Amino acid sequence: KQDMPPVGGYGPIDYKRNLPRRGLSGYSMFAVGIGALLFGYWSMMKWNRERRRLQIEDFEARIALMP
Amino acid sequence: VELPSLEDLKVQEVKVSSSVLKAAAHHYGAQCDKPNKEFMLCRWEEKDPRRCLE
């Protein structure tokens, strides 16, 4: 008399197949790429030109002496 | 050829280190200006730094 089949309690689990967790698509990408890229170029011309100012300063001490 | 004697040598060389020589290095020549450019003509325009020693 002690056999298995239970009265209730069932799901089931799915046979489904989906995980569309997107994801900033469709022209939202290529937008964070370009602006941060020119931001790095914007970081230039305030350092290389600044080091160029120090570069003439470095060559200044050479020319002032040597007579 | 000829070379001048051991005299007109052994004058007071500025016995300083290179860092303290490059320390000021900017106010030094910026206000003297009388013998140096004349010494440049004495060396650049006229060669043979043996007429040019004084």
Binary contact (A65, B28; C-beta < 8 A): yes
**Distance from chain centroid for Cα A5:** 56
Q: What residue in B sits closest to A62 (Cα-Cα)?
A: B25
Nearest CA in chain A to B25: A61
Candidate from B25, B35, B37 with C-beta closest to A65: B25
Experimental method: cryo-EM
Helical residues (DSSP H) of A1-67, grouped into ranges? 31-43, 48-64
Give the nearest chain A residue to B34 (CA atoms).
Answer: A67
Q: DSSP string covering chain B, please?
A: -----SSS-S-------HHHHHHH-SSSGGGT-SHHHHHHIIIIIS--TTT---
Chain mean position to CA A9: 48
A44, B9 in Cβ contact below 8 A?
no
- Residue pair B15/B21 in contact (Cβ under 8 Å)? The answer is no
Q: Which is it for the CA torsion A18, A23, A25, A29, positive or negative?
A: negative
What whole-number distance in Å separates Cα of residue B46 and Cα of residue B52?
8
Query: Do the beta carbons of residue B28 and residue A64 sit within 8 Å?
Result: yes
- The verdict on a CB contact (< 8 Å) between B21 and A64 is no
Query: What resolution, expressed in A, was reported for this entry?
Result: 8.3
Q: Alpha-carbon distance A36 to A43, whole Å?
A: 10
- Measure CA A33 to chain center: 8
Of B21, B30, B39, the CB nearest to A67: B39
Cβ–Cβ gap B22/A64 under 8 Å: no
Distance CA A65, CA B18 (A): 12
Q: For B3-14, give one letter per residue: b (16+ CB within 10 A) or e.
A: eeeeeeeeeeee
Q: Cα B6 to the chain's mean position, in Å? A: 18
Q: Is B40's CB within 8 Å of A65's CB? A: no
